[PDB]
Design a binder for this molecule. Sequence first.
Ligand SMILES: CCCCCCCCCCCCCCCCCC(=O)OC[C@H](COP(=O)(O)OCCN)OC(=O)CCCCCCCCCCCCCCCCC
Ligand SMILES: CCCCCCCCCCCC(=O)OC[C@H](COP(=O)([O-])O)OC(=O)CCCCCCCCCCC
Ligand SMILES: [Zn+2]
Lengths: 165, 297, 161, 196, 265, 157, 98, 75, 55
Amino acid sequence: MLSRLLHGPGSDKGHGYFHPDHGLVDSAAQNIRGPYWHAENMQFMQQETAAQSSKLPVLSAQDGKTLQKIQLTDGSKVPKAATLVKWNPKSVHQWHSDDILRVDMTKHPEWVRTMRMFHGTVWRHRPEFRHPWFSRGSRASGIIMLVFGAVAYGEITFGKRLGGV
Amino acid sequence: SAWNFQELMESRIPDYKGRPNRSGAELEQVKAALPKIEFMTSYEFDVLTKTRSNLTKEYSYQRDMRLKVTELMLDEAPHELEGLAVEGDAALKQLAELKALQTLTEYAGDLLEGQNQIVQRVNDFVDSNPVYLLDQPLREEARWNLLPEMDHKTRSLVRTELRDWLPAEYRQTRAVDLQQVAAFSPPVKADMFRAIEARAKDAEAEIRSLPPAEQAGLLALVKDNVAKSKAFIDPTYDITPEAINACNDVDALRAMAHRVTEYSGDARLLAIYGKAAQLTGDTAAQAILKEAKDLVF
Amino acid sequence: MILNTNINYGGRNSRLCYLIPLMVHTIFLYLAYLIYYNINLINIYLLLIIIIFINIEWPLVIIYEYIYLTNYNIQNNLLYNIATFIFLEILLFIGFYWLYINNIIHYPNNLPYNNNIAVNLLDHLNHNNNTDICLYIILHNLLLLLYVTLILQLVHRYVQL
Amino acid sequence: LGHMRVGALWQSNANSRGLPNLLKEVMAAEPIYPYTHPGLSAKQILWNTKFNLKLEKDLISIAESAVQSQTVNKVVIPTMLTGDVNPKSPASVVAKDKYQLAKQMAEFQYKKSYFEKPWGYMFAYYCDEDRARLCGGIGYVGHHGGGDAEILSYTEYVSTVVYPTIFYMAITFVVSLFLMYYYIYGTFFSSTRNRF
Amino acid sequence: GTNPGDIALNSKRFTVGKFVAWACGGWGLKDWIFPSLFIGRGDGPDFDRIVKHTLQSSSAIEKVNWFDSPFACYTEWFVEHFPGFFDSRYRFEMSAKTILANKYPIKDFPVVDMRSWRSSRLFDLFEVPHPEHTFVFGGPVLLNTEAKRAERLEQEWHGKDGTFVDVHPLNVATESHTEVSVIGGIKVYNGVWQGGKDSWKRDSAKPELTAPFHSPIWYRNMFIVKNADQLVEHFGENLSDETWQEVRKEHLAFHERFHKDYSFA
Amino acid sequence: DSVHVFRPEFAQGKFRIDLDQPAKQNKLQQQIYTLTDDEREMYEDEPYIGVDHLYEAHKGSKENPVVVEAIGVHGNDVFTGCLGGCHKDAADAVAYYTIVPPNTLAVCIDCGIHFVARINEQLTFWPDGTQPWEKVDFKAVEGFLYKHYKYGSPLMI
Amino acid sequence: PLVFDPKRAFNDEIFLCCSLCCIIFLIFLFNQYEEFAHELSFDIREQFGLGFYMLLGLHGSHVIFGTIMLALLTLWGAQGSVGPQSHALRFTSLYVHL
Amino acid sequence: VFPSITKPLGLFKNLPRQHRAARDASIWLAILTAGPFGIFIAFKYYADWYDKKLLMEYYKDSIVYGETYGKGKYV
Amino acid sequence: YFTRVHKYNHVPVPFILNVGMSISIVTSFVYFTYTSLWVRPEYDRVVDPSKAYVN
Ligand SMILES: CCCCCCCCCCCCCCCCCC(=O)OC[C@H](COP(=O)(O)OCCN)OC(=O)CCCCCCCCCCCCCCCCC
Ligand SMILES: CCCCCCCCCCCC(=O)OC[C@H](COP(=O)([O-])O)OC(=O)CCCCCCCCCCC
Ligand SMILES: [Zn+2]
């Protein structure tokens, strides 16, 4: 099918676009309401809150109650005392529940790098300027290339290669 | 699968289905569950919900702001009109004072417009960030759906919550229509007329405590104000049953019936149409009027 | 509070608007000088160091713009540009294959040697056989690249799921 | 730094020029109250404003007290289709009987005398003023158009201009074919003359 | 037009500017030797034409508030280049005054300026020279996004039934309304608060603070947009077509003595 | 039995603005399509639904105008337009654009339609991860809005 | 603090795959260089030799660029910056497949 | 103009009207292409036939091409 | 309003113009095709086996 090859509906023009069976999934839905195409074979776990992180620079912007409502887990082994809650498709609210166990993904290197880009450096409108010495090297390279070009033009035209003087 | 040209959210095509297919048992169950329903003509709903006084459909806080600004402007008028000097006769001085008053009012009109714009901007912010002003479960239903795309119950709940998030002086609720409430409640009209007469008498006393020429000018103004205030609250206040009984012209009775129908369509229609039927011998009309006074009124 | 503009990536001023052209100019004048005097005006390793250093700006700006300026419109633009670049590379390969096969599809050819039959035991396979082309090692390299393709496709799909 | 602006109040710039105040443009240095409040001086206008303001306050208070402390005897819920934000307006803007026709005719006569001819003359002045603004070598006024232009509808134009033109083109085509063939070869159906 | 600047320093026969123009473009010996052909009348105000247009005017010139308006600095340009300027301006101002003296509560005034012209190409709606950054906050918004979509064709494109597109369940519920009122003992539910599109009426008009509550006066400036390539105007409820044709005839009949003595060559 | 945690999308800024309110942003960036030639033919011969159009006031009347909403800066003129042919005598070949002051009643005297182009500013919380996760009140918002009205705020470019 | 974590880096699938692909690409480059010098008899100054060598040299240049891309993606995957929907991953996959 | 060939032939009756019109357009595109190809192929085959006829009527009594061109065996 | 659909603005061709244009175009095509493909006489062959010469 040309339509399906070029990322279209396919044979049926009223058909959708996503085929999560072969890896064509919806990132927006996953980020907002979680991967509801894994809903049949995955279940939320229900029962260490997040209040211990209420004093950190980036999490201090939240209220105490908000962090108290969040319950954490080690994220490796199943808590044997934790019940299982069925994951209901077509329900946009279950991914945001406070009764389900969660995992503190605030020590992830990507998390730290993002928040540092926002909370750990002086804001520069130009990412190249966010690195001072590299910008220095780059402008120096530009000047070097200008000089090299001028010298090469001078040498090739006049037939003397500047090494004997 | 190695590519992904998705968008933030696919467009939504409505599914129409149709009116429910309720069987006989379901039909009887529904009919036994309804209240005592009175089906209303579109004219009745129109007169109930017509725009009469609040011409611009301005909310409460906008009217309050306008009245407050008028008070503040009046409290400053004598200072601005004091000491004006211009070369000319009395008429030229009067025109100079009129221009000064106009400048004062144009100055005050801009502050009011600025404040209206600021409150409108606050409310625009409320709409622009709805998920940050809502609790669960309405938050996700405001996140995923637009106003036209919400269920009626969820739509109403979301709008009410967003309105109530604001302070009392920013909530956008339509102001009361004086003429409407007077037209659909006979006591309210009587109270309004009593208030008009009380203010007229008090103003007449205040005027009578003033020098002569001002007395005549202000008394004429008071008469005009009372007349126009009455015509504003109830344009048909002169169509009394005494006047109806005193009227023996078919065209005049038709005019009265039209004027009442425009205003409220109340039992005075029964009176006018009964007197028209008697003067013309319309037995069918008399039967219809009996039915109306039994049911309509 | 911030004021939100259109989805379109507004754009930033950058030094890459002239650094890359100056890099191309440097490379071409380097080639011209090497052609004229048969010697290098600047050491080749130093030249490659300059070239590499100039182009480190792309990943940095890419990182800091993904962190801050990205949405599905921008991602679609970028992916379509990637597709067009792949198309250009395919066309380049097609042109070079045209160059290669021009004199091979045209079977008749004036050869320094004999290729008729019944004169020697091997003449009849002189023109139709370049028997030194390292076929066994070419097949080994083919196996390596098939490994890479299949493994990469598997991993890509696995993470995507 | 130069003259940095203080605050962020509205300034007329390229992106925004504001909403003109035609009333002040027209009634410049002339009072408006002789038209809105004829016959009244400033003191009378202020006194009337105060009296009416107090009266309006009283009426508003009465109305709010009434609406906020009345017992509900009936509940009116209009019918609307599912998925519809607001019910359809039950008011019609078309006269139905002859009395409504006479009423709307009187209203139309008043509006014509007092609201439509003013609009027409204002718009005519605006068009002429735009012409004057673009005149004098600034823009392309007078290069085409005018009151003598012959404006034709689609049917009239196609029937009286397009088809005859194509007809003349076709006749020219045939005549030129024959004449050119004769001119070059010297014959009409025999190719070169004195050769074949 | 053009602002000559300092007339004094450009009148001299020999000038650095004239020599530079000769060298590079704009001047030459043809101007020094034959000014009557290559300079001639030049470009500037025509005093005689201004006097003629002034003295052809009626007493409207006395009764117009033009000389106190902010555009009074353009009096000579419009007197010269707009024949019959004062009579047309007087009609314009009297039209505004009669709209002001109406019996309607809302006085609508038509506004036309450089923005009142539509165009099919977006670069024609900007001021020249164009701003550095344009359409920063997105592009145009089409009014057609507020019209009902082609539901039938939309269903048909997808291969959906669409049989009952015009048959919808009725809805009579209190949960569907947020605007509740009490009108004479009757609790009326009607409408939902939508937001910024429910307050278009008040945000468009400005009140006269001195007008009483029983005789309100509101001022509204109605903007006008036209294509200028249409040749036919349809004002809607503001002006009927028959009245507009009447106004056209009368305007062309009155403003004829100001136009008949000139040729367009 | 095992526990899985899907890797979240950490990007902030424009992406997090898009993912916080996907309905509004999609509305801003959702393409809609116009009718082809056969579709125009099939639409022009569809029937009206009821006799309401003979009595009611059309959409685009002096009392029922076409209100439209753009995003931008307060007071900036709004860009709006027709697709052409709102009237029989109006052109329909291509879309026709318009520049109009905000929050004012404008009338197109080509078609005769009254419209209310108006601006809503997209003031949103600084997206750096400090956005609030639970219902917020009017105090902090009051301060931010006061500062924006008095002085202005940066643009998300 | 931001500290490199070899445990997490080695427990990540993208880092392993890209490193393995970069290693195989380097092996391929070395092998192909070993047949250009000490295997063949014809040089780039012949009829078939020139076209063949131009083709394989262009392919080798593209392989070098792909090796650089795979190394960059290995660096980003070690840091944990490459997500499932990464256009960098998409570009490298498409380029390697090409 | 281009009337829809599928309507008077009853093809693609299960498709919505838009897609049926698309098929009609494809069919018309197919028809318009086959015209010039048909004209030129007809002319070429007529030219080959005429060449065979000429070689038959000229090399009928020849001794060199009396059996190849004369009979038309390898014209 | 779609004003360019098939139901609007149909202008019938006057009979005289129709006849003239049809005759003109038919005559043009016939004459050109005739003189281009049928009046080619420079492709002349003379069959004469008695004009050969051999020493
Ligand atoms: C992808 C690309 C593939 C590669 C390309 C392949 C080829 C492309 C297309 C090939 C076809 C081209 C046109 C073929 C027609 C012309 C050849 C022909 O029909 O020849 C017949 C005739 C020979 O007759 P002759 O030998 O002159 O006379 C013998 C006794 N009188 O011929 C003559 O008389 C020749 C003299 C006239 C020459 C001028 C043009 C004549 C064309 C038509 C001739 C026949 C007339 C029939 C048509 C009616 C016209 C009114
Ligand atoms: C600037 C344009 C130059 C290119 C030439 C194009 C000329 C097109 C003229 C077509 C006239 C036309 O409308 O054809 C329709 C009529 C049939 O009439 P009806 O069915 O519309 O009522 O059909 C007829 O009337 C038959 C006449 C068609 C003959 C073709 C035109 C001959 C003119 C050639 C000029 C070079
Ligand atoms: Zn329009």
